[PDB]
């Protein structure tokens, strides 16, 4: 009878259900498409073609009507369909969407906003059915997206085009090209791209524009750049030439990075940023603010006993207020960015900060997949941060899980529920295999290299709690057979789920997690024997105990020597505990 509102990402700021919903007709009347945003219309056209919905030549009173346009379009038929709702009073990228009584109206605050209004439209429609809603929506953070800045195998050309379509659909508006192991980015930054590399760049810039993504071209000259004299001039002119050749293809955002280098000449670092900001960014007139990261970029490396270190203090003293400055939080890879941490760093820089969030990146621990949600990021961080980006994994497809939640966190920050965002991410990306993918991904959220790098939601916490509850019940001689039978089910389910994934996941996802899927099936088997050891020990049956103990050690040995790493502190640790 009634059309429910489906999963939405990101969560729209304001949504009221105003009716029962209706079915969109075979063909629709399209109004406002001549004056509306070129890219928004295209995104709408593609969706309609895919879903077999034609567009009428002349108006049909029986057909569903769709009206679209910006605030600054003079289209009265649009304001008429919005029913007193407006985008006029919303911040940039905001939109209004109303659907009632056979009409759908999308008014964006600007072009970007109209595009995003279409994305929400796309998510609302299921089998030609749409709910009757009144929506107004806008981002918490104005810059949201991805910095490809990890070490290891850079994403393929095909990887990036697919990512950009994915960002557009989830209202992320920033992609920073800064892969560490691209020679022309870092190692040999002075050298121009070959012609065929420039043609690939061109395709990326185009696709970025088509999806309202600000393509940021990054460059990391900090290894061997000279600062003084004729050499400093030549080296600066190399930055201009490189940035020019990309401006001339349509790049309007630029980054200059100083992370992970020997040279800690703070004054000369900023002196370069400022000159580029003057002679290039401001001179061009249509270039977004310059983005950077200092050589000291985590609170630990930046601050000492409440006060900034020599590098940080001179860097902030010199760098122009308009330049976006990035930092990673309390550590390079850390549990939290508490509100107080952003307050301190934002204080030192007397500006709104940018976040380089190092998750789900796995370059420091390539055996594990980071498949968790945004976690430990304070929900009031928008107070000191106006620019938010995640460093993803070298595995592009599986990075989508974590990025999906980053879209929701940075768009609607104070509403962000991490467990709900995580569940929705997998529900939306995995369809039929969502339930099983959750079982698997649930064990692969926490990242820990045992030394300097810790981050992410803890692995399968409910299962960890049940494991701790067992040891307590056993060592105090309480009855445990209710919990044991419950745990057998869990471990069997882990095995059942992973086998179903191996059988049914499409290649693009499977070729990125198959080794870890194998690792978890093994541990699930080691856990089952661990229980068998517990049961036999209670039964005082040495035959069944020793038999199970060998099976358990056999699984643990497979896991400890294999490249793939998963569920260290839970499924793996349980076997170790039982021995």
């Amino acid at each position: 009878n009634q059309v429910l509102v489906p999963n939405l990402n990101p969560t729209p700021e304001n949504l009221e259900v105003v009716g029962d919903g209706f079915k969109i007709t075979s063909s629709i009347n399209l109004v406002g498409e001549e004056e509306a945003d070129e890219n928004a219309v295209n995104a709408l056209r593609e969706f309609l073609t895919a879903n077999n919905i034609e567009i009428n030549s002349e108006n049909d009173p029986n057909s569903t009507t769709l009206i679209i346009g910006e605030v600054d379009d003079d289209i009265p038929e649009l304001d008429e369909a919005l029913n007193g709702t407006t985008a006029e009073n919303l911040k940039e990228e905001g939109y209004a969407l109303v659907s009632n009584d056979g009409k759908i109206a999308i008014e964006g605050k600007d072009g970007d906003g109209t595009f995003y209004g279409v994305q929400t439209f796309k998510q609302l429609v299921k089998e030609s059915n749409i709910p009757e809603v009144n929506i107004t929506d806008y981002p918490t953070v104005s810059a949201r997206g991805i910095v490809e800045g990890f070490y290891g195998t850079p994403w393929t050309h095909q990887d990036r085009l697919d990512q950009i379509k994915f960002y557009g659909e989830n209202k992320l508006n920033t992609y920073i090209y800064a892969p560490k192991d691209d020679p022309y980015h870092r190692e040999k930054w002075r050298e121009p791209y070959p012609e065929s590399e420039m043609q690939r760049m061109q395709e990326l810039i185009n696709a970025s524009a088509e999806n309202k993504v600000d393509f940021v071209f990054g460059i990391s000259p900090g290894i061997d750049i000279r600062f003084d004299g004729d050499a400093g001039e030549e080296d600066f002119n190399h930055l201009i030439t490189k940035a020019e050749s990309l401006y001339d293809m349509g790049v309007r955002s630029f980054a200059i990075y100083w992370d992970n280098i020997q040279d800690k000449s703070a004054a000369k670092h900023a002196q370069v940023l400022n000159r580029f900001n003057e002679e290039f960014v401001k001179a061009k007139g249509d270039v977004k603010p310059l983005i950077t990261v200092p050589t000291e970029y985590d609170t630990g490396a930046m601050v000492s006993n409440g006060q900034p270190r020599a590098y940080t203090r001179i860097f902030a003293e010199t760098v122009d207020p308009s330049i976006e400055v990035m930092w990673t939080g309390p550590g390079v890879v850390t549990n939290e960015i508490p509100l107080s941490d952003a307050q301190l760093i934002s204080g030192i820089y007397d500006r709104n900060m940018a976040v380089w969030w190092n998750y789900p990146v796995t370059d420091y621990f390539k055996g594990k997949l980071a498949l968790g949600p945004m976690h430990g990021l304070d929900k009031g961080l928008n107070q000191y941060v106006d620019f938010f980006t995640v460093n993803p994994m070298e595995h592009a497809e599986l990075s989508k899980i974590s990025i999906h939640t980053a879209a929701d966190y940075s768009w609607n920050m104070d509403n962000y529920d991490y467990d709900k965002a995580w569940n929705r991410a997998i529900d939306m990306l995995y369809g039929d295999l969502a339930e099983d993918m959750k079982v698997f991904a649930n064990h692969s959220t926490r990242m820990d290299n045992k030394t300097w790098a810790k981050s992410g939601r803890e692995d399968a916490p409910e299962l960890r709690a049940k494991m701790d509850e067992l040891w307590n019940k056993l060592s105090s001689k309480e009855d445990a057979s209710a919990l044991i039978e419950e745990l057998y089910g869990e471990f069997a389910r882990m095995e059942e789920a992973c086998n179903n994934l191996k059988a049914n996941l499409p290649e693009v996802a499977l070729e990125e997690c198959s080794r870890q899927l194998d690792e978890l099936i093994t541990l699930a088997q080691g856990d089952k024997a661990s229980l068998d050891m517990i049961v036999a020990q209670l039964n005082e049956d040495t035959e069944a105990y020793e038999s199970a103990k060998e099976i358990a050690q056999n699984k643990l040995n497979t896991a400890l020597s294999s490249f793939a790493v998963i569920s260290e502190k839970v499924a793996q640790s349980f076997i170790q505990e039982a021995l």
Binding site: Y151, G152, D259, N260, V332, D363, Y364, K366, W452
Partner: peptide
């Protein structure tokens, strides 16, 4: 292959 990583940050220090």
């Amino acid at each position: 292959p990583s940050t220090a």
